Structure 1
Amino acid sequence: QDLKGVWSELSKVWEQIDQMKEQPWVSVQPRKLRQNLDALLNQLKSFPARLRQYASYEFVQRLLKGYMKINMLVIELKSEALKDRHWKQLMKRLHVNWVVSELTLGQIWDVDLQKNEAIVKDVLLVAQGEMALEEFLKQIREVWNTYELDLVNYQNKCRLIRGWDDLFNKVKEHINSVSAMKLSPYYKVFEEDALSWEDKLNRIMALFDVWIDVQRRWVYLEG
């Protein structure tokens, strides 16, 4: 009859949902996820008229609609800005345990993302700011671990320093940027690195400020 058929199709869609859930959160691709969700929507819509009038059919219908809606949140949750801290903030603010190393897509799919979107967006923006600051400090590390003084000969007696202006602009830019980061609302867990780096940059700035004066005086006296 019609009821047996619609129950069998409900079993089919339950098995499909279970197969989607059992795939761990670390391996699910949101693009493939939306492809599979669209496939499930077409699987639901392709059913005959008799199976389209049942209450369970409606249940899986708006259930998959909500899944496709929260798919967007699935994209933002799949990012590199929430390495460990922001996930733990999510658990403590949502009061449900979700350890990333054991996390599967089913566990995230269990919780209502219609309701808890506010905390998600807040921690998302927090994480974006955190990773912006972290990438800036990484750029600082990369640029300063490789920068060197451009040296040129002078009267074939010693190799003096050429390019004071560029290094001065670089150090002043870095100092101003870290001081401005000190005012950023996301400047909480990066404080120690910022203090160490500003100490290094102040040392560099003072050292080269007196170095250029010593250099000019020495070359004047040599002349």
Structure 2
Amino acid sequence: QDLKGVWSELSKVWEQIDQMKEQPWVSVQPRKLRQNLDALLNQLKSFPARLRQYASYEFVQRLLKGYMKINMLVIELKSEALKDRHWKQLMKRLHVNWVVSELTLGQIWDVDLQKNEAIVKDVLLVAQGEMALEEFLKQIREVWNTYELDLVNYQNKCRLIRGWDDLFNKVKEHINSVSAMKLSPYYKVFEEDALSWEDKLNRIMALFDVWIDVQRRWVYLEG
């Protein structure tokens, strides 16, 4: 009858949803996930009005609607934000024991992301702040690993260092910004790295402050 037909359609939709949820979280593409969820919703809407009044169909449709709503949270979760420590915080707060390698969208969808929106958003914001500071340390690291001291010949005797203003401005800016993250709240995560880089910058500053004076006095006495 009509009930048997709607049960068969519900079974087909459930099979489609389970087959899609078999996709591991690593390989779940949010854009394609949204497109396929929209296709499933359109398939559901293609059912006749008599079949649409059944409670099971309404429950499946509202579950898919909730998945579409939390699709933004899916996009935000599958970024370079979470890494695995923030995932560990999410596991600790949600009291669920998943496997990172075996993680699939089905496990995450079973846990109510809509109900846990506050926890998820807090974890995402913490992951955002860390990325910014970590990237900044990486920048500083790249700049000071790719920095070369310019040398210019002096009367065919030696090659004195040219570009004191640029180097001193860079050092001062970096020192001020190092103090700046030392003021940051997310700084406790990168505390030791910031301390080490500050020590390196202080050593550089103290070396070049004496070096410029030695260069100036040396050229004066050479003349």
Give the TM-score category using the shorter length: over 0.9
Q: Deviations for 1:106-132, whole angstroms, at most 9, x for unmatched residues?
A: 000100111101011111111111000
Deviations 1:53-75 (A, max 9, x none): 11111111111110100111000
Number of residue pairs the alignment of both structures matches: 223
Distance 1:136 1:18 in 2: 42
For residues 80-133 of structure 1, what are the alpha-carbon distances to aligned partners after superposition, in whole Å with 9 as ceiling and x for unaligned?
Answer: 111111000001111112232110110001001111010111111111110001
Q: Aligned equivalents of 2:16 and 2:92: distance in 1?
A: 31
Distance in 2 of aligned mates of 1:81 and 1:28: 16
Q: CA offsets per residue over residues 133-182 of structure 1, 9 Å max, x none?
A: 11111111111111111100111111101100000011111111111001
Superposed CA RMSD in Å reads 0.8
Q: Match of 1:186, SS?
A: helix
Secondary structure at the aligned position of 1:156 is classed as coil
Q: Structure 1 CA distance, aligned partners of 2:38 and 2:165?
A: 59
- Alignment TM-score, normalising by the size of structure 2: 0.98
Distance in 2 (CA, whole Å) between partners of 1:84 and 1:24 is 16
In structure 2, the residue matched to 1:123 is 123
Between the aligned residues of both structures, percent identity stands at 100
Query: What CA distance in whole angstroms lies between the structure 2 residues aligned with 1:50 and 1:210?
Result: 87
Q: Give 1:60's aligned residue.
A: 60
* Structure 1 residue ranges (4+ consecutive) displaced by more than 3 angstroms after TM superposition: none
For structure 2, which runs of at least 5 residues remain unmatched after alignment? Answer: none
Match of 2:188, SS state, is coil
CA distance in structure 2 between the aligned counterparts of 1:112 and 1:103, rounded to whole angstroms: 16
> Where does the alignment leave 5 or more consecutive residues of structure 1 unmatched?
none
